[PDB]
Amino acid sequence: VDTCSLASPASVCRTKHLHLRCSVDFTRRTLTGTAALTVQSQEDNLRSLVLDTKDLTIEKVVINGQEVKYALGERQSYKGSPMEISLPIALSKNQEIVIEISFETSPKSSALQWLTPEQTSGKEHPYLFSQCQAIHCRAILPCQDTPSVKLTYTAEVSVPKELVALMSAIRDGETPDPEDPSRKIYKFIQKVPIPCYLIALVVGALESRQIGPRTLVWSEKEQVEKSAYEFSETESMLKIAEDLGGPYVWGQYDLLVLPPSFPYGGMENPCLTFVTPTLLAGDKSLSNVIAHEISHSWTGNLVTNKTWDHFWLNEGHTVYLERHICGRLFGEKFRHFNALGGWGELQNSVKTFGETHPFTKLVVDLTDIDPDVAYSSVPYEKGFALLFYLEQLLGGPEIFLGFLKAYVEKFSYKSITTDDWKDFLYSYFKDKVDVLNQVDWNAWLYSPGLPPIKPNYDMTLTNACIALSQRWITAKEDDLNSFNATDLKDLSSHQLNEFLAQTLQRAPLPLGHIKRMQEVYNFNAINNSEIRFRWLRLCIQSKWEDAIPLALKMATEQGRMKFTRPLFKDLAAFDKSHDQAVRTYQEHKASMHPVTAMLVGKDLKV
Ligand SMILES: Nc1ccccc1OCc1cccnc1
Numbered sequence: 325v326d327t328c329s330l331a332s333p334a335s336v337c338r339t340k341h342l343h344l345r346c347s348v349d350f351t352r353r354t355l356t357g358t359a360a361l362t363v364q365s366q367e368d369n370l371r372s373l374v375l376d377t378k379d380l381t382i383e384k385v386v387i388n389g390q391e392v393k394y395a396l397g398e399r400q401s402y403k404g405s406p407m408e409i410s411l412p413i414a415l416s417k418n419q420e421i422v423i424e425i426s427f428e429t430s431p432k433s434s435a436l437q438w439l440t441p442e443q444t445s446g447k448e449h450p451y452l453f454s455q456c457q458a459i460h461c462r463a464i465l466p467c468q469d470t471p472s473v474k475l476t477y478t479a480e481v482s483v484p485k486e487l488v489a490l491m492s493a494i495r496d497g498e499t500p501d502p503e504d505p506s507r508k509i510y511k512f513i514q515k516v517p518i519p520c521y522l523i524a525l526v527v528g529a530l531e532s533r534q535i536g537p538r539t540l541v542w543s544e545k546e547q548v549e550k551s552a553y554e555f556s557e558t559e560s561m562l563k564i565a566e567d568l569g570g571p572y573v574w575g576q577y578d579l580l581v582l583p584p585s586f587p588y589g590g591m592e593n594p595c596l597t598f599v600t601p602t603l604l605a606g607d608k609s610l611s612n613v614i615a616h617e618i619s620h621s622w623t624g625n626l627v628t629n630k631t632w633d634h635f636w637l638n639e640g641h642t643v644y645l646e647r648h649i650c651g652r653l654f655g656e657k658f659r660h661f662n663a664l665g666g667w668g669e670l671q672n673s674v675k676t677f678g679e680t681h682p683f684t685k686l687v688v689d690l691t692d693i694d695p696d697v698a699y700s701s702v703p704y705e706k707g708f709a710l711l712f713y714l715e716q717l718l719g720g721p722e723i724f725l726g727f728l729k730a731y732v733e734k735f736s737y738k739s740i741t742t743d744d745w746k747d748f749l750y751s752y753f754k755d756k757v758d759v760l761n762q763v764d765w766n767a768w769l770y771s772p773g774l775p776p777i778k779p780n781y782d783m784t785l786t787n788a789c790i791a792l793s794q795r796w797i798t799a800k801e802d803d804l805n806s807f808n809a810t811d812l813k814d815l816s817s818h819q820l821n822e823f824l825a826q827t828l829q830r831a832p833l834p835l836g837h838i839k840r841m842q843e844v845y846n847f848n849a850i851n852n853s854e855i856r857f858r859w860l861r862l863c864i865q866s867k868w869e870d871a872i873p874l875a876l877k878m879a880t881e882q883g884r885m886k887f888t889r890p891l892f893k894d895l896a897a898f899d900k901s902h903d904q905a906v907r908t909y910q911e912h913k914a915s916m917h918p919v920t921a922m923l924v925g926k927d928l929k930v
């Protein structure tokens with residue numbers, strides 16, 4: 325059972341297909357049209373069914389060419405309002421019908437951000453983007469908003485003719501709109517059954533440039549050249565992923581580089597990955613995020629978590645594949661470096677939440693919990709740590725990669741639970757059951773806190789990071805002079821980042837140390853978002869007032885929650901910036917992403 329959804333479950337009825345016909349109204353900030361759901365009964369004598377909705381206005385529901393009865397239940401907070409539809413004729417098991425629903429979205433749709441021209445790069449046109457994961461599809465259209473159901477889709481999207489629509493689907497042509505010549509209709513087909521959280525739409529002044537045999541990069545014209553360079557490893561990564569995961573089944577792999585308020589590093593929307601412009605470091609150094617989104621083309625999009633309680637399946641295996649891709653490109657030592665960095669991030673999350681907190685369990689119980697509130701690094705890094713531990717228990721990366729490929733093959737086009745995964749692990753490694761039985765399953769899967777066992781990590785790339793961090797931590801005032809720019813000479817951007825991560829784990833440091841750090845290392849000059857993020861957190865937590873306008877600027881000039889949330893929290897926790905932090909949030913709140921605005925609000929207790 326999916327406790328995040330109010331719809332009839334998959335055991336009752338299944339959506340097989342969505343035909344979406346809609347128009348994007350920028351003057352009203354509404355999407356208006358029809359969602360025609362092809363629904364298959366899983367039961368005898370089915371006479372009603374329920375769909376998820378959230379902030380939707382329903383005009384009518386048509387089945388067999390006539391309007392039918394429906395009712396909207398009371399809103400259940402973040403879950404939205406259940407919509408019960410009265411079938412005109414009782415259905416037998418496996419019978420299919422088409423239910424056509426006329427709806428309009430609200431300007432406040434938690435799935436959508438509507439941007440004014442001023443919020444864009446070009447300053448001439450408005451822009452719209454969606455983000456359905458986890459349970460925001462119901463805020464665009466009535467559906468069974470649960471990843472336990474997979475459907476294909478087709479769509480026709482009418483937009484102002486000077487703008488471009490793109491979806492998580494194959495582009496299927498464009499024509500002028502016969503109902504309004506100031507508009508174009510863009511068409512889309514997704515022939516691979518997907519969970520509805522992977523439905524995606526962007527509308528904006530978009531341009532494209534090809535960067536590989538199956539990849540266009542899309543963005544506003546101002547960002548096209550930089551993006552094309554930043555993401556040029558994309559085809560190489562696809563070829564590696566295909567080798568590890570089996571065939572890429574989605575046809576194209578395009579990239580869309582969003583405006584700065586996109587709330588995540590990326591979103592694995594099929595055919596069209598969405599990414600933050602905060603990846604544009606200029607040197608490809610944040611490309612692990614592309615590797616990660618590419619990996620979702622197998623783990624997540626082919627094999628899918630049945631409910632959000634099992635989100636680690638999606639994320640753990642994806643981080644696992646992600647790190648293999650980068651290990652193939654840059655070496656096994658770098659894979660170990662990133663793996664160990666991940667353990668560090670998990671230490672951070674568990675410390676932040678508290679070692680007994682329910683959100684530090686690998687498998688979580690989301691009953692009455694908003695998934696956006698529960699979201700963290702835990703499913704990513706605790707999930708990865710389990711897989712990395714298993715890899716080491718079961719004979720190493722070659723062997724475990726054989727399991728991963730078989731697992732993808734076994735569960736493609738399906739939605740699964742942790743028990744499904746574990747059953748298959750035991751099946752695949754049947755001659756190593758003795759070794760599998762040594763695993764503390766109850767702790768790994770169901771207990772809060774750090775895992776019961778830490779994997780073995782190569783230290784080669786990490787040692788210099790730890791060494792330098794420890795010099796700074798143990799330094800007294802008379803040691804500060806010995807620091808110099810040459811300390812960084814042999815460190816990659818990755819290692820600088822890990823140096824800062826190490827030091828941040830011990831923050832605050834004395835203000836004089838941090839001032840010295842800026843003096844000799846000039847971290848203020850670094851535009852790498854990951855590095856700049858940790859550096860500003862270190863400065864604010866160490867009470868450097870000079871850093872306040874810098875942290876405020878970063879927190880607001882982009883909206884990636886990974887960065888915006890902790891910067892606002894740090895600013896709020898520093899007495900000198902507290903008031904300005906709260907004021908800045910209040911002033912920006914209406915023009916922020918609705919999920920981000922909600923969460924920063926909660927973080928700031930505002
Ligand atoms: N959020 C979350 C936390 C712990 C386990 C599963 C989860 O899934 C819900 C989710 C996923 C992605 C984005 N937003 C919410």
Ligand SMILES: [Yb+3]
Binds near residue numbers: 800802803
């Ligand atoms: Yb000394």
Ligand SMILES: [Zn+2]
Binds near residue numbers: 616620638639642
């Ligand atoms: Zn992911």
